[PDB]
From a paper:
SARS-CoV-2 3-chymotrypsin-like cysteine protease (3CL protease) also known as main protease (Mpro) mediates the maturation of viral proteins by cleaving the two viral polyproteins pp1a and pp1ab at 11 sites. Mpro represents an attractive target for the development of antivirals against SARS-CoV-2 as it is essential for the viral life cycle and structurally conserved among alpha and beta coronaviruses, allowing the development of potent pan-coronavirus protease inhibitors. Here, we report a new class of peptide-like inhibitors of Mpro identified using the commercially available DELopen platform (WuXi AppTec) that provides a library of 4.2 billion compounds (screened by the user) as well as the services necessary for the sequence to structure decoding of binders’ DNA tags. The identified inhibitors were peptide-like compounds containing an N-terminal electrophilic group able to form a covalent bond with the nucleophilic Cys145 of Mpro, as confirmed by x-ray crystallography.
The two most enriched binders against Mpro, SLL11 and SLL12, were also the most potent (SLL11 IC50 = 30 nM, SLL12 IC50 = 53 nM) while the least enriched binder (SLL08) was not active at the tested concentrations (IC50 >50 µM). SLL11 and SLL12 are peptide-like compounds composed of three non-natural amino acids of which P1′ present an electrophilic group. Both compounds were found to bind to the Mpro active site with similar binding poses proving that SLL11 was not an allosteric inhibitor despite being selected and enriched also in the presence of the Mpro inhibitors X77 and GC376. SLL11 and SLL12 were structurally similar sharing two out of three unnatural amino acids, and both were found to bind to the Mpro active site. Crystallographic studies of SLL11 and SLL12 binding poses showed that the side groups of all three residues (P1, P2, and P3) and the N-terminal cap occupied one of the major subsites of the Mpro active site (S1′, S1, S2, and S4) with a novel arrangement of the peptide-like backbone to fit the binding site. The compounds interacted with Mpro mainly via a covalent bond formed between the electrophilic P1′ group and the catalytic Cys145 close to the S1′ subsite, and a hydrogen bond formed between the P3 group and His163 in the S1 subsite, while P2 and P3 hydrophobic residues occupied the S2 and S4 subsites. The backbone of compounds SLL11 and SLL12 in the crystal structures assumed an unprecedented semi-cyclic conformation with the N-terminus and C-terminus stacked and possibly forming a T-shaped non-bonded π-π interaction. In this conformation, the N-terminal electrophilic group binds Cys145 close to the S1′ pocket while the C-terminal pyridine group binds in the S1 pocket. Co-crystallization of SLL11 and SLL12 with SARS-CoV-2 Mpro confirmed that the N-terminal nitrile electrophilic group formed a covalent bond with Cys145 of enzyme’s catalytic dyad as reported for several other peptide-like inhibitors of Mpro.
Residue numbers in the entry:
A (entry chain B), B (entry chain A): 1 to 306
């Protein structure tokens, strides 16, 4: 039945994307009700970026400094405020296409769909994971800033990511929609080290469950392990520790397949130690770690979105 | 920076997905104007499937045998016809969300976005390739039939695929939206061998160009080759022949990178012969072949969609 990097449908988010211009910067903004959210670095010139005082830069801005275009329609900015690193432009018009939404702060490991936009217009949609070092390995160009990551539960869009910058290593960094960066990053043009990246253990397990649901059973082995002995081996291969919360979230998949998490863990231990012997799991020769337990359930059980 | 399996935004297609029920079979249909398109095997019982006479089964169907639900809204079927393997249900209501669209028959190697649906509701969106054996390596479950593949050019949705069946090997087969199967497949429960699957050479090349644009240069080697000497090696590794047309299509990427196609070919030759030596290209330990030259340009140049 197959298994793919599968994104949410983008329709609900497409209707919220606007173009926001200030000074020499055009990026994207998120139009929900009568508010447009965008990265506040839109207010900076090249020179401001080196050491911005955002409180002072904003005081010196006026509503008229901001041009927001929604399609062929200029939105008039009637107010402006700043929440952490997100700029909130109050506009004259509530988006008639505002979906049900929440703003959620996700954890490292968790995945979301990205709607990459340029000039307020969607370019494409792809699935991403928040890396343990709070970066995301996006596909973003110049003008992508303001693009958002989201999940959908039933009819509710949970916005969890807004893109702010690309680091020198080519990976991306951003905020929740309350404006707080994921990770030790600041919206300043100053050198900033991503922490060292690790592998999202709980996701690799989830993906192995996915492999079992799709028939692949070769990696199932006769060994068993304790959580602690597993985490010792994990550590050595630059894997995130497996928590009890992780074991609990894998519960559904363990019940669906009948294979216990610690059993699956022992199978992963051996994959880590010995390798794959030129075999593949779900078409991959590497252990894939950008699928959450929930992502697997949703793809393997057929969860739809209203 | 970065490179992902990136699907078109699904919004324009989300509004066309309906639920079509007939007897006990529920699948998806495509609601464009006052017509709903779905796979005609929806009219078959388990027993009909073994050797259906579709002309006769349909004559014995009535408009009232078909339940079409669009959201929480029953569409009344007021007519039914059959085009090859697609059922066309005339309904009382033109879809108010019908986009600009064409129905296009794609060729093997070309890619498209799939909006996987169940019960007329989208589950996810992902990028796919028409395999050289006219199958697609989808992610589809029971009830996915009627789900469509599409591309978007400016504001126009080109529908190119409608899902009809899964083969025993777990790969999928379907029709264009005129109802003609891709490949030697029939909407009948009779054994059907997919031809042997080969690798889409021109796409692997395009993806290597993508790798070069994203900095990866290790696989570039000092060798060069003739097209014919390349195709001899390709054959041995189950790669599609490289045509002159393929070399011409890769022109843009060859110009962007400055690496000539035959030069890139020699780099692929070596990858095929020697392997990767535990190195990776764009995070992958396998040669990826589900990105067209155009897909690479589009993602690396940032083309948007309205
Ligand atoms: K600016
Ligand atoms: K075991
Ligand atoms: K495409
Ligand atoms: K070369």
């Amino acid at each position: 039945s197959g298994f793919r990097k599968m994104a949410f449908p983008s329709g609900k988010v497409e209707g919220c994307m606007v173009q926001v211009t200030c000074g020499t910067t055009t990026l994207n903004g998120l139009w929900l009700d009568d508010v447009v959210y965008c990265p506040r670095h839109v207010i900076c010139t090249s020179e401001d970026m080196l050491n911005p005082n955002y409180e002072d830069l904003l005081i010196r801005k006026s509503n008229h400094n901001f041009l927001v275009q929604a399609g062929n329609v200029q939105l008039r900015v009637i107010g402006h405020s700043m929440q952490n690193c997100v700029l909130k432009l109050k506009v004259d018009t509530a988006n008639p296409k505002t979906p049900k939404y929440k703003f959620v702060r996700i954890q490292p490991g968790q995945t979301f769909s990205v709607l990459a936009c340029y000039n307020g217009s969607p370019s494409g949609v792809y699935q991403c994971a928040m890396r343990p070092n709070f970066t995301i390995k996006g596909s973003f160009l110049n003008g992508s800033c303001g693009s958002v990551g989201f999940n959908i539960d039933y009819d509710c869009v949970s916005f969890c990511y807004m893109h702010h910058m690309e680091l020198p290593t080519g990976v991306h960094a951003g905020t929740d929609l309350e404006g707080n960066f994921y990770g030790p990053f600041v919206d300043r043009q100053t050198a900033q080290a991503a922490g060292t990246d690790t592998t999202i253990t709980v996701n690799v397990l989830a993906w192995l469950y996915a492999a079992v649901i799709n028939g692949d059973r070769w990696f199932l082995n006769r060994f068993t392990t304790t959580l602690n002995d597993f985490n010792l081996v994990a550590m050595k291969y630059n894997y995130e520790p497996l928590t009890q919360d992780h074991v609990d979230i894998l519960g559904p998949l363990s019940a669906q397949t009948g294979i216990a998490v610690l059993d699956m863990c022992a199978s992963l231990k051996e994959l880590l130690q010995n390798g794959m012997n030129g075999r593949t799991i779900l078409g991959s020769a590497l252990l894939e770690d950008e699928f959450t337990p929930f992502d697997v359930v949703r793809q393997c059980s057929g969860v739809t979105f209203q």
